[PDB]
Amino acid sequence: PKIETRTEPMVINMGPHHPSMHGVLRLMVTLDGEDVIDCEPVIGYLHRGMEKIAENRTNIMFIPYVSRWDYAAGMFNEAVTVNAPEKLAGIPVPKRASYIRVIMLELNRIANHLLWLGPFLADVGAQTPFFYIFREREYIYDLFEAATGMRFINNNYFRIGGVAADLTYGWVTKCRDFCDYFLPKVDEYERLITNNPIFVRRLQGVGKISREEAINWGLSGPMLRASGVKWDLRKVDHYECYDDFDWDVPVATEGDCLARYIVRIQEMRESVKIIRQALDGLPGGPYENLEAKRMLEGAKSEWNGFDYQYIGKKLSPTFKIPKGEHYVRVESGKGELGIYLIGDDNVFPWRWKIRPPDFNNLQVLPQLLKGMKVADIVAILGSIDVIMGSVDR
Amino acid sequence: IDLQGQFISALQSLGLSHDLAKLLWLPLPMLMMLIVATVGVLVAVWLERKISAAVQQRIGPEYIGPLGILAPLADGLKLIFKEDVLPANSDRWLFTLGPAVVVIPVFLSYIIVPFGQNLLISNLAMGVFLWIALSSIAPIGLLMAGYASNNKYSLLGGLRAAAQSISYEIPLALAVLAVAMMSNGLGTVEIVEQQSQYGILSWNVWRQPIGFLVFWIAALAECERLPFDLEEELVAGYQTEYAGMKFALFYLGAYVNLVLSALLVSVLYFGGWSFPIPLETIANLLGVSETNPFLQIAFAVLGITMTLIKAYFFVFLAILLRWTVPRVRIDQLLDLGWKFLLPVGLVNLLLTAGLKLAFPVAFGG
Amino acid sequence: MLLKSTTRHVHIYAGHVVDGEVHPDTETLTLNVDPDNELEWNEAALAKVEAKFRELVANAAGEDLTEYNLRRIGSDLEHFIRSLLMQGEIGYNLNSRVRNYSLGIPRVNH
Amino acid sequence: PAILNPIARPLAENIILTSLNDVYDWARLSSLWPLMYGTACCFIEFAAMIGSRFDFDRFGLVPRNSPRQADLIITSGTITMKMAPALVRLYEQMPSPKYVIAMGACTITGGMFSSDSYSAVRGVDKLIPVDVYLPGCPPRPEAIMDAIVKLRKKIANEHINERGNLAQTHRLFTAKHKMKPVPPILTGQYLNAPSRQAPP
Amino acid sequence: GLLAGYQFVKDLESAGALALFVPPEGGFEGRYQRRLRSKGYTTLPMSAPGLGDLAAYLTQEHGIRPAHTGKEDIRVYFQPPLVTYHLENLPPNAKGLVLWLIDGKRLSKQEFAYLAQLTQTLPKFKVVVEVGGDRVVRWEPLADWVAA
Amino acid sequence: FLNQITNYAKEAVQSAKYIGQGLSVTFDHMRRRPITVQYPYEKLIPSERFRGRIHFEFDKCIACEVCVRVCPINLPVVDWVFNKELKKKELKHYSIDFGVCIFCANCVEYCPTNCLSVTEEYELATYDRHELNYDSVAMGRIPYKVTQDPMVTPIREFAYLPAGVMSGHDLPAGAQRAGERPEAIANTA
Amino acid sequence: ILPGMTVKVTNPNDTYYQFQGIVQRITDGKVAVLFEGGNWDKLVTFQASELEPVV
Numbered sequence A: 001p002k003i004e005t006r007t008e009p010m011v012i013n014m015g016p017h018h019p020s021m022h023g024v025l026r027l028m029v030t031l032d033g034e035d036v037i038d039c040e041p042v043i044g045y046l047h048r049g050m051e052k053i054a055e056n057r058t059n060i061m062f063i064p065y066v067s068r069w070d071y072a073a074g075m076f077n078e079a080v081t082v083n084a085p086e087k088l089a090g091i092p093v094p095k096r097a098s099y100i101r102v103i104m105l106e107l108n109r110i111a112n113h114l115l116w117l118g119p120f121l122a123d124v125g126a127q128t129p130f131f132y133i134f135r136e137r138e139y140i141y142d143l144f145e146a147a148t149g150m151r152f153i154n155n156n157y158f159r160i161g162g163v164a165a166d167l168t169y170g171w172v173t174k175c176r177d178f179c180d181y182f183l184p185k186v187d188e189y190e191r192l193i194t195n196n197p198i199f200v201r202r203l204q205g206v207g208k209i210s211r212e213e214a215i216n217w218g219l220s221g222p223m224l225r226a227s228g229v230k231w232d233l234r235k236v237d238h239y240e241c242y243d244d245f246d247w248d249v250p251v252a253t254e255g256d257c258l259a260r261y262i263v264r265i266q267e268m269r270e271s272v273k274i275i276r277q278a279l280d281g282l283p284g285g286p287y288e289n290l291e292a293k294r295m296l297e298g299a300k301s302e303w304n305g306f307d308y309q310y311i312g313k314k315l316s317p318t319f320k321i322p323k324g325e326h327y328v329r330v331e332s333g334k335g336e337l338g339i340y341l342i343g344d345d346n347v348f349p350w351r352w353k354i355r356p357p358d359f360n361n362l363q364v365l366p367q368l369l370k371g372m373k374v375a376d377i378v379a380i381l382g383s384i385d386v387i388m389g390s391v392d393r
Numbered sequence B: 001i002d003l004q005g006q007f008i009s010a011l012q013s014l015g016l017s018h019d020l021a022k023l024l025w026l027p028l029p030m031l032m033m034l035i036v037a038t039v040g041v042l043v044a045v046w047l048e049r050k051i052s053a054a055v056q057q058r059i060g061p062e063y064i065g066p067l068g069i070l071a072p073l074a075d076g077l078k079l080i081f082k083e084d085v086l087p088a089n090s091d092r093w094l095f096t097l098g099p100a101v102v103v104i105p106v107f108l109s110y111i112i113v114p115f116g117q118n119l120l121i122s123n124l125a126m127g128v129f130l131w132i133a134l135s136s137i138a139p140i141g142l143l144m145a146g147y148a149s150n151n152k153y154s155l156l157g158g159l160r161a162a163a164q165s166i167s168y169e170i171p172l173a174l175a176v177l178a179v180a181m182m183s184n185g186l187g188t189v190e191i192v193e194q195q196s197q198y199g200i201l202s203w204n205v206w207r208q209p210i211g212f213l214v215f216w217i218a219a220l221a222e223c224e225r226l227p228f229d230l231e232e233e234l235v236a237g238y239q240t241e242y243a244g245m246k247f248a249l250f251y252l253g254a255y256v257n258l259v260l261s262a263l264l265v266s267v268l269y270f271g272g273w274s275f276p277i278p279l280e281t282i283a284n285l286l287g288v289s290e291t292n293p294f295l296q297i298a299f300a301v302l303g304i305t306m307t308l309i310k311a312y313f314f315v316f317l318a319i320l321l322r323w324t325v326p327r328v329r330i331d332q333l334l335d336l337g338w339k340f341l342l343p344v345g346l347v348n349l350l351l352t353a354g355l356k357l358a359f360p361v362a363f364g365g
Numbered sequence C: 001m002l003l004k005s006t007t008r009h010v011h012i013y014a015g016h017v018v019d020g021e022v023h024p025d026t027e028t029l030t031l032n033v034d035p036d037n038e039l040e041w042n043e044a045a046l047a048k049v050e051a052k053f054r055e056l057v058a059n060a061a062g063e064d065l066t067e068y069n070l071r072r073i074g075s076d077l078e079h080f081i082r083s084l085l086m087q088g089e090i091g092y093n094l095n096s097r098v099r100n101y102s103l104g105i106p107r108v109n110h
Numbered sequence D: 001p002a003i004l005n006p007i008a009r010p011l012a013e014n015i016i017l018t019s020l021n022d023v024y025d026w027a028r029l030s031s032l033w034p035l036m037y038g039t040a041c042c043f044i045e046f047a048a049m050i051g052s053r054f055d056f057d058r059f060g061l062v063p064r065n066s067p068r069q070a071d072l073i074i075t076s077g078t079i080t081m082k083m084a085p086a087l088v089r090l091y092e093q094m095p096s097p098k099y100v101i102a103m104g105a106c107t108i109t110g111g112m113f114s115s116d117s118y119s120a121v122r123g124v125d126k127l128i129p130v131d132v133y134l135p136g137c138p139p140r141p142e143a144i145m146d147a148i149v150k151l152r153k154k155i156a157n158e159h160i161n162e163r164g165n166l167a168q169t170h171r172l173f174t175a176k177h178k179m180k181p182v183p184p185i186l187t188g189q190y191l192n193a194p195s196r197q198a199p200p
Numbered sequence E: 001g002l003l004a005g006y007q008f009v010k011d012l013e014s015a016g017a018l019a020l021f022v023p024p025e026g027g028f029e030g031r032y033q034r035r036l037r038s039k040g041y042t043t044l045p046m047s048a049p050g051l052g053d054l055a056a057y058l059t060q061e062h063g064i065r066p067a068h069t070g071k072e073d074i075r076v077y078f079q080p081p082l083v084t085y086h087l088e089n090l091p092p093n094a095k096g097l098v099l100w101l102i103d104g105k106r107l108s109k110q111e112f113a114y115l116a117q118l119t120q121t122l123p124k125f126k127v128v129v130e131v132g133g134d135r136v137v138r139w140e141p142l143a144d145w146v147a148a
Numbered sequence F: 001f002l003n004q005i006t007n008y009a010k011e012a013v014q015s016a017k018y019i020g021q022g023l024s025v026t027f028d029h030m031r032r033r034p035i036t037v038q039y040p041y042e043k044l045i046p047s048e049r050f051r052g053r054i055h056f057e058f059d060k061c062i063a064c065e066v067c068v069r070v071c072p073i074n075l076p077v078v079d080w081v082f083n084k085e086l087k088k089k090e091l092k093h094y095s096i097d098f099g100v101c102i103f104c105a106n107c108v109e110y111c112p113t114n115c116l117s118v119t120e121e122y123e124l125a126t127y128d129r130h131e132l133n134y135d136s137v138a139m140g141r142i143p144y145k146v147t148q149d150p151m152v153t154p155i156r157e158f159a160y161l162p163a164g165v166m167s168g169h170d171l172p173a174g175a176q177r178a179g180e181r182p183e184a185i186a187n188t189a
Numbered sequence G: 001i002l003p004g005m006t007v008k009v010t011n012p013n014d015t016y017y018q019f020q021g022i023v024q025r026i027t028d029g030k031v032a033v034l035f036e037g038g039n040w041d042k043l044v045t046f047q048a049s050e051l052e053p054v055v
């Protein structure tokens, strides 16, 4: 062995394995003791070349790829890639279909917020939110397997006209039971942090992200709300009738890990309130009342029309898109998702520019890891809620 | 009764020279205590696995035997069959004998713990010295294995684990000193006799309540239950370099240290081989108990049972408090140790000396 | 920097094996053919593989030492191994612990 | 020759040695220490088994982050060619009685990235010898337990007299090249860079 | 445990096809599969759900169509019979061959009689089919399972 | 200076009370039964929406080559020939690889004559990958039912429980699909 | 029964209660039943005494 201890700064090379919950990222940490001076991130072990996939591909052949873009929720990319051609060609959408769309989007946002505080609390302390959070997510897994057929992203469920399938018979009742049971589980998770030992004092002043630096660096998502900027993209642009229920954006004063935790903790309750008001909506009730009013009443008298249908119009498999470019923005669980699509009157599009939400937020990680300890590196890496499939893509 | 005296008389009736006959009598209990120690280790591994399963609402290892009790035996039989791998360095004998230097004295310290008046090995004067000075050797083997590890991160983790281990030796000695002052002796036999004189009212847990908590915190820091030093600055502290054999040796050594600490804490504070009702009243109520062994054998079995339920209770409490209290950093652990266990231990020794010099009636005199 | 590129059969190491380890050296390229028990070999086809490796390392001249060119040389070597297998030469062996046809399945010409 | 890719052609035992071989195989069947390696949602599907719903621990498999105390590796996820020498070194640093379970459609073959792709590796069997394949995108955790069951059925096929197969032959060859020396790659040097604070 | 002797080999040499009942929680047929290699038989692992037709894959040659992506044209690969080519360059000692089917639950009872006649037509290879089993290791004749 | 000592003592007794509350909830967690399932002794019930293997029929097929363009990888091949006696084409061979399959069930939806079917098979484990080109007579077999196997124990998932059950392990009644089927509503109401 | 007729499952133990299906083929006393729910066509097999013919 040749270990010559000298008076030079030690370069720590964190490998791209990360065998706790993280993907592939080569971190080169340069320090001179019990601090952190420099940090170099190296990516490129998960890039699959998605932009070359959409060079010769139609809309019906791009759904599993665009669902395998991000492996946390997936349906946000499907929702924007069924919104881009329907706005390029000008195809309307029914109200009940958009209600089902926003219900499934908020139900995936619930699971996406649930898969952040697992490793973030595991890498800082006791390893017993793990099994209960995984049980609470396996409940959502069984609910989605009963509803559509799968537990996550491998699920098409979306076309240009609307949703090809419908909800089952007991899905609304089990969803009401899940809204009954999910609220004390998040009150317990807030009571775990509202009166605590030094866990509150440990991650209290490690980030310290100011407002103007977050605006200049281009932060979007829960970090922009933790900095104190009300830029929720669902309030700027009404996506699918977002101006009908009550809304409340949780805004924190300072930007730290505890504030970014409690913003998502409150946002769980806000999403529960939104899906409760969506169950309070649904103009026509569940599928049983709709089937009874269809089979009991006349053929086209009052119920069967344009607004309350499965799709509304069966689209062609090989259809032509109009020539032009388009850009839409949707607030996702990580940040803002956008698609810059260019068509030139053909089946296969010309340019498919993808706007990733985590690749723009990863630029704060060289600024965040500066002058901190060794044990705060994994907590800082887990607090931003980044995904290697989103920054490599 | 006396099995050793009867064996000596039988070997004298057979015809021998009284020296080689008495020479070979000791290795049979000297191997019996070792094999029941491995039995207790195979008990404790299955117990820790099934209790960690029952805490997190699941079932432990199954489909290996009746309920998976052969799984520690299967692990110990499989890990000695694996290929011993070596890194690209020198000093292969040092890398081999490092874990041997770790494993020798913790296994050697089995001559101290008792199980009764006669069911023990050595009680000469100073068994607490033979525990402390032999348990304070394993940092040398840890630093030797870290130097023979040939790594930048594993050596730093071994240095951090050695600095964590050597700091909790001084309150571990002061809490022993606070009981040895009151017991006016260093052997465990007089310590357990001063507790087994009376029943509950002569226990050292009610006489020294702060020292028991200090000794328990020092034992949980020494046997690496709450300090996670096995995410340790890249992946692990003193791991990711050995094979299945050296990892199995480290695992059994850690479980031997846990079993020995869980026995020694109860022996020094609560007291194995003890009953809430004194044995003299039961012996006077039953009949004549001075030569009849039919009740004495049952009393020895009851003392072994009391020691075993105390050891099982302390093991279950330690492995229940492992996943109960959250993980704290090693710097905060060293800070809380050096700022709590030493000053309250010193003032506890001072108030112990003051209470012994004030009223020497209920203390050791 | 230890430059290497190996998949299952070829090992192009940019060093030199002294006894059991390697040292970084940009002057010697060591080639290891089929380290795992997957194909049975001989002395003539291995000599043809070594001659093709010498021809491929004589073709690549005046270029920088990067991972891309070394991986391209290893890919041409594995393509030569696959064409030698398809030519009517040595193939798989029924003596390993696992039998996975990674290059091709035995088929019929006519 | 009319046959493409040909296959070359390649006893009393004791009862006590047979029982010792049964014990030696039963120990490996009972312990079965795995390695958790995952870069995508297949790692989340593997971590869903570690939770208290499917109880993957009850067969004897315990989660270890060390690629040295694991006799079984579980590769999972879309594999980039930049991660292929990393996977080769992680497989080679394991001890000799090792097993390979490949979970996923993009792992055992090209998967969805087999039509228009230039970075994804089309098959992990080109990198590591796969013993038990597992199709599915993503597969059921019951299918992963079925692959564990088939691996346990395949481990007991080994012998104690035919143990001379877990090695690698030498076949060394030494040749020279005429390549040019390359400048080194960046190691750090991100924040305190001379072109970062001072604008050119 | 249970010290098993040499009894499956005699039952395999007496009849032509056997069906063993194993517990599906782990693996216990590997001991008999290793005892068969210790007696001098060459084992061949094969999966029973994916086989196509038994006649065209075991007696004659078949044509496999690889999955093309539109890049290549429609090609056909001529696959020989598996057990015939395994019996061609087989023998070190010329004792016998066995065929092991892992998941024999996803099969019909029509091809089982054809397989039991095929293993009796050529006396050089055996047929071993696995059933999901009921709590104990027991062997049964495959012709008796077909007839009943 | 004494107020910092009293604040430290208050923080210490609050940490001791938090440790005691953690011990209390840990002792509370030992009372509930385990909610896990055994394999292969307690297999889950597949729902009507959970997909699986692709089943192909050789009778209700016309070889129209429609579902090949719907597939992004074009995995089902159509080996069709042209016959001069008839006026249409016939299918000779049908092969499909399953190692590159996404299992999204998109070619089954765009089928007017329902030539493809969903089969409840997920137990696919093979030591080699070259047998994955499944034949039509291999895809035309009978699926394995989890009910008819007497060695497994049937247990439903969370969303298949009557009137709301949080455990879903005992199931003493025989009721399922919590709600009402749309047949008795037309009878009563 | 004949392949091509509509049957109905009436077993109170299974999850599929009173579901109309299409018979595909008959072998070994087992009936393949094709269900039509939504936009996907599932095929769940049953027995010969489990189903009842519905005109």
Ligand SMILES: CCCCCCCCCCCCCCCCCC(=O)OC[C@H](CO[C@@H]1O[C@H](CO[C@H]2O[C@H](CO)[C@H](O)[C@H](O)[C@H]2O)[C@H](O)[C@H](O)[C@H]1O)OC(=O)CCCCCCCCCCCCCCCCC
Residues within 6 Å of the ligand: B001, B002, B003, B004, B005, B006, B007, B010, B028, B029, B032, B033, B036, B039, B040, B043, B044, B115, B117, B118, B119, B120, B121, B122, B259, B304, B308, B311, B312, B315
């Ligand atoms: C969660 C954790 C779980 C932990 C695990 C729990 C599960 C396992 C629990 C198992 C129980 C734990 C072990 C028991 C405590 C250890 C007792 C022991 O070590 O104890 C050691 C004992 C020795 O202890 C005592 O030893 C005495 C000798 O003591 C002398 O020697 C001692 C030193 O050994 C002390 O110094 C003592 O002061 C001194 O007096 C006598 O021998 C006593 O009889 C004996 O009880 O070893 C023996 O038992 C003798 C060794 C066997 C010798 C066989 C006897 C010889 C055969 C005689 C046959 C006679 C045949 C002729 C018959 C005549 C026919 C007419």
Ligand SMILES: CCCCCCCCCCCCCCCCCC(=O)OC[C@H](CO[C@@H]1O[C@H](CO[C@H]2O[C@H](CO)[C@H](O)[C@H](O)[C@H]2O)[C@H](O)[C@H](O)[C@H]1O)OC(=O)CCCCCCCCCCCCCCCCC
Residues within 6 Å of the ligand: B001, B002, B003, B115, B116, B117, B118, B119, B273, B279, B296, B297, B298, B299, B300, B301, B303, B304
């Ligand atoms: C197929 C494989 C087959 C393997 C075959 C192996 C068979 C042989 C091993 C079997 C061991 C199990 C059988 C139990 C024997 C227990 C005998 C016993 O305790 O014998 C007692 C004697 C008593 O010793 C004598 O006891 C005397 C009386 O003292 C006792 O009483 C005094 C009263 O004040 C004091 O308390 C004193 O401390 C206490 O020891 C003196 O101490 C003498 O010095 C000493 O000789 O111990 C002795 O000699 C020492 C005996 C050592 C036994 C230690 C084993 C652990 C005990 C089993 C665990 C308890 C299980 C009971 C289960 C019942 C459940 C309901």
Ligand SMILES: CCCCCCCCCCCCCCCC(=O)OC[C@H](COP(=O)(O)OC[C@@H](O)CO)OC(=O)CCCCCCCCCCCCCCC
Residues within 6 Å of the ligand: A197, A198, B213, B216, B217, B220, B226, B321, B325, B328, B332, B336, B340, F011, F012, F013, F015, F016, F019, F020
């Ligand atoms: C019947 C026998 C029961 C004995 C059980 C006792 C064993 C428990 C020992 C704790 C091990 C873990 C130590 C971690 C402790 C931990 O991690 O936090 C320790 C915590 C550190 O807090 P901070 O980091 O804020 O403090 C340092 C900073 O303030 C720096 O300025 O506070 C302490 O220093 C106070 C310690 C009180 C500890 C009390 C322990 C005893 C609690 C239970 C009392 C039980 C009474 C039972 C009556 C029946």
Ligand SMILES: CC1=C(/C=C/C(C)=C/C=C/C(C)=C/C=C/C=C(C)/C=C/C=C(C)/C=C/C2=C(C)CCCC2(C)C)C(C)(C)CCC1
Residues within 6 Å of the ligand: B302, B305, B309, B312, B313, B316, B317, B320, F023, F024, F027
């Ligand atoms: C005579 C005899 C016998 C008997 C026995 C017995 C009777 C026993 C029992 C006993 C027991 C059975 C014991 C045990 C115990 C244990 C436990 C039970 C522990 C646990 C607990 C804990 C550790 C906890 C903690 C806590 C605290 C401290 C605080 C508060 C809260 C709580 C409570 C949680 C026999 C048969 C053997 C034989 C021989 C003789």
Ligand code: SF4
Residues within 6 Å of the ligand: A068, D040, D041, D042, D076, D077, D078, D104, D105, D106, D107, D111, D136, D137, D138, D139
């Ligand atoms: S097979 Fe599917 S689930 Fe697995 S890594 Fe590939 S895309 Fe993800």
Ligand code: SF4
Residues within 6 Å of the ligand: F060, F061, F062, F063, F064, F065, F066, F067, F068, F078, F110, F111, F113, F115, F116
């Ligand atoms: S399965 Fe359907 S789409 Fe495919 S060739 Fe047959 S009829 Fe046409």
Ligand code: SF4
Residues within 6 Å of the ligand: F054, F070, F071, F072, F073, F074, F075, F076, F100, F101, F102, F103, F104, F105, F106, F107, F108
């Ligand atoms: S499920 Fe999808 S990937 Fe599989 S064959 Fe059908 S269209 Fe192709």
